[PDB]
Design a protein around this ligand. Sequence first.
Ligand code: VW8
Lengths: 237, 300
Amino acid sequence: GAMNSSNYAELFNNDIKLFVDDTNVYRVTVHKTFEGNVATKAINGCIFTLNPKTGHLFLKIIHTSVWAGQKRLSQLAKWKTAEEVSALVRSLPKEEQPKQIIVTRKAMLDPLEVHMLDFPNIAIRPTELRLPFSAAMSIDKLSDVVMKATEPQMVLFNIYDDWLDRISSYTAFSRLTLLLRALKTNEESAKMILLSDPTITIKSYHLWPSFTDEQWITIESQMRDLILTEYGRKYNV
Amino acid sequence: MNTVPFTSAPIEVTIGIDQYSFNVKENQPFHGIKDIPIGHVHVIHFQHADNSSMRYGYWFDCRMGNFYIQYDPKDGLYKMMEERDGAKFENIVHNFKERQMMVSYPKIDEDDTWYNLTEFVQMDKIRKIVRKDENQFSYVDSSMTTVQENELSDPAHSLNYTVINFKSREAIRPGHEMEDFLDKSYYLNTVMLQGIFKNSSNYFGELQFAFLNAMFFGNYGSSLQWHAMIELICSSATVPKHMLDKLDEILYYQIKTLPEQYSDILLNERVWNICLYSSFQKNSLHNTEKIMENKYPELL
Ligand SMILES: N=C(COc1ccccc1)NO
């Protein structure tokens, strides 16, 4: 069934699972036409498919050509996502195929279920968690490869860099979701926090800076700051 | 006009014969039902006064044999039987008619209700849904489950309706996932009509039989089947014009006949709102939409 706070450690057990987030698949800018009407212009997007235990990210880039001449694009986008996830599963060796796929939005349940009919033993699950994966396009290297794509493309990343050498996957996922929640709530400030110190760099083969254990504690504190200070400004506390 | 005699009525019971019902008291001198119209299937059904649990009954066609009812005190129910001795039967019936011990099928001459509810229903197809090949008539009751229900437990006592499942490989062509899920025409016209049912008459017959079992017996799996068969047509963009027109007439008479106070359990809000207001055929069921809006506006 649905995934929530009560069954959160299940993410880090040894059953292979993937999160699928479709938020950034169909992206547009809205603008005025010469006649003063409104139109949309699509820009490149991506499917965010993540193994939360290993950090492996399968970033399928969605090039704007896939929308040419199509109608009802927001609906098509969900089916295209499901097609691409199904294609990815079929491409993996049997022993790497997931046992469960968790979709971050419930509107992906039926499209994915239909595309995976051939895989009756893979569970398709929703979640009650409000995960911040939409903010993936605030990670500079991910945004860069999506916007530069001139054709459909899959790019593989480890979204945890080398963190699992030093911390568990529960802690790594917690750090990731904190970083992404901060980038989603106030991107400019979150990015200021992460790069303010010119002496801490991002390795060529990494996504995030090379913080020591102690610096991650400072960084993580600065991000909380931000999320709790917003909550109050948004509601009252 | 044919007759279904009763040996006796040892237990107090409400007896249905099609849309009509009457009460028989314990050991009242009741010996059956006469003047049953030839040319239609019929259902004779029972609800005991002591235990309203278990509505049960029999589908039959008087052209296929001479049938009677006899209470069984061991199994505790009124059983249909076939009498093979034609002269014994004619003689039994004539004596009961002479003593005026039989009630009369009270068909108003203007009234086409039963025809309209059973237009496509044939005994031979009933007997393939309800398997008991040694009898010419078919027993159904409130509790019998469907083949599809047993997949999600006694097979000999099941309703073998055609399984419809919108998220199934039968329903969804590889490479047409979005197309086939959002427009069910492939599944309706190729898989079901051409492949399984062969024609729309057999499709409508099963739809009508499912409705009647839902209504007369409270059979939940039959209600599920009726709604699935409606939804499959309404969710198809491409349906023959004659099928839509006939479906509207079929549903109109079903909604007209439904007891007002059973609508809450016999009608699925989601299916009907989708069919009448969101689906491809939202504008093709004028008679059904008009009666639904005037009789059951709450459901919508
Ligand atoms: N029309 C009726 C009652 O019809 C009958 C039939 C046979 C004997 C008595 C009454 N209820 O719907």
